[PDB]
């Protein structure tokens, strides 16, 4: 609903930030974004309209949606550096559960 979590990793590490949720009805939309001075949108998924990668075409291994009306909204980060460190927020719009939010503060040591 509104959770903050600290994630610790090193240089060259692999991490999958997963937002797990369940709906009584259906999933409306879901997104991944990095929050700093501005909200920089990474990816958006809609069950009807599909995926949308804000950046380049090779975004196949960047996000995954694993579908009982249960889901796993995952953001994949591989061979990470100090520039990848920051706050990553996921927003899950569910019907009629509403908006769920989870903020992951990724720290590279």
């Amino acid at each position: 609903v509104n959770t903050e979590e600290n994630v610790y990793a090193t240089l060259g590490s692999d991490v999958n930030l997963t937002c797990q949720t369940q709906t009584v009805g259906f999933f409306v939309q879901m997104q991944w974004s990095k929050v700093t001075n501005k909200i920089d949108l990474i990816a958006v998924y809609h069950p009807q309209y599909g995926f949308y990668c804000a950046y380049g075409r090779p975004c196949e291994s960047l996000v995954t949606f694993t579908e009982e009306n249960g889901s796993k909204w995952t953001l994949h980060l591989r061979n990470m550096s100090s520039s990848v460190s920051g706050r990553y927020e996921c927003m899950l719009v569910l019907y009629p559960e509403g908006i769920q939010t989870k903020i992951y503060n990724l720290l590279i040591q």
């Binding site: 939309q29 949108l41 719009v93 019907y95």
Partner: protein, 300 residues
């Protein structure tokens, strides 16, 4: 480039209804799909008002004024009926768009109440200690109205706040304190009431009424009075609130001599052939009391 157009704050009056404006501005060539509209109160856990493109409206009083099934959702403006004190706060208007994602704005709702302004004069007498002479009351206002006094006389104000008849409203009462004097009665003092509900600040004027005993004075005599002079006249200059009810003429040695004849508020001096030395007294009567004024008259 898709932006949400809405004001930072919106004024709404207590008891009546208010429309919270919120529109999604999309450039002519840009393509977007609004899955749903969301209205939420800051720190209320659940949602307040939701409009889904296929499901429709859902509320906790509240109504979507422009949203409709079939048409592409753009205007998320919501009408709030029967404004309460507890309705004042911060609200979020979220748009679940594709492929632009979630876009939102924060709107502050300001619950107001138009106050009833009334000015009054405080009738006072003469005393050393300062006492209120004017009154300015701003009944049933939200937030409490600002009251200031526009006067060159220079008087310290006694401003106090008291609860209003309706919940959330405050009545502001301000008293203009000043030491009462004769050179203050009749002068005007303006009260300036300021509130967000008013387009222009309401200015109310009150005319000070001070009750003072007669300020009796005698003018005319200038020592240059020769024997067998022209029929001179002495005037009794008097200023009092209320106005004088009588003018009595006499001397320290008893009644007026044959040369001095009383003409109400005036006194005619007939020519004399013998030297005289008499001190005339002018007695001015009023509701508060009577005051005296002496003047020495010498003819040589």
């Amino acid at each position: 480039d898709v932006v949400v157009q809405a004001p930072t704050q919106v004024p709404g009056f207590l008891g009546d209804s208010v429309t919270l404006p919120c529109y999604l501005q999309v450039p002519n060539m840009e393509v977007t799909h609004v899955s749903q509209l969301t209205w939420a109160r800051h720190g209320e856990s659940g949602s307040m008002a939701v409009f889904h493109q296929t499901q429709g409206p859902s509320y906790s009083r509240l109504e979507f004024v422009a949203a409709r099934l079939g048409a592409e959702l753009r205007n998320a403006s919501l009408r709030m009926f029967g404004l309460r004190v507890e309705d004042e706060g911060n609200y979020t208007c979220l748009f679940v768009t594709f492929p632009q994602g979630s876009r939102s704005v924060d709107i502050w709702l300001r619950v107001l109440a138009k106050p009833q302004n009334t000015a009054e004069v405080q009738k006072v007498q003469l005393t050393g200690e300062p006492v209120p002479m004017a009154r300015c009351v701003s009944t049933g206002g939200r937030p409490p109205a600002q009251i200031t006094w526009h006067s060159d006389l220079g008087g310290m104000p006694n401003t106090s706040q008291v609860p209003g008849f309706l919940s959330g409203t405050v009545t502001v009462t301000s008293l203009w304190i000043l030491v009462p004097s004769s050179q203050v009665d009749g002068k005007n003092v303006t009260c300036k009431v300021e509130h967000e509900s008013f387009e222009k600040p309401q200015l109310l004027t009150v005319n000070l009424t001070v009750y003072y005993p007669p300020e009796v004075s005698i003018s005319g005599y200038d020592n240059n009075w020769y024997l067998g002079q022209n029929e001179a006249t002495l005037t009794c200059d008097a200023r009092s609130n209320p106005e004088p009810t009588g003018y009595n003429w006499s001397t320290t040695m008893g009644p007026l001599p044959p040369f001095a004849v009383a003409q109400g508020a005036q006194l005619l001096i007939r020519p004399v052939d013998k030297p005289i030395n008499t001190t005339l007294i002018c007695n001015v009567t009023n509701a508060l009391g009577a005051r005296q004024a002496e003047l020495t008259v010498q003819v040589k």
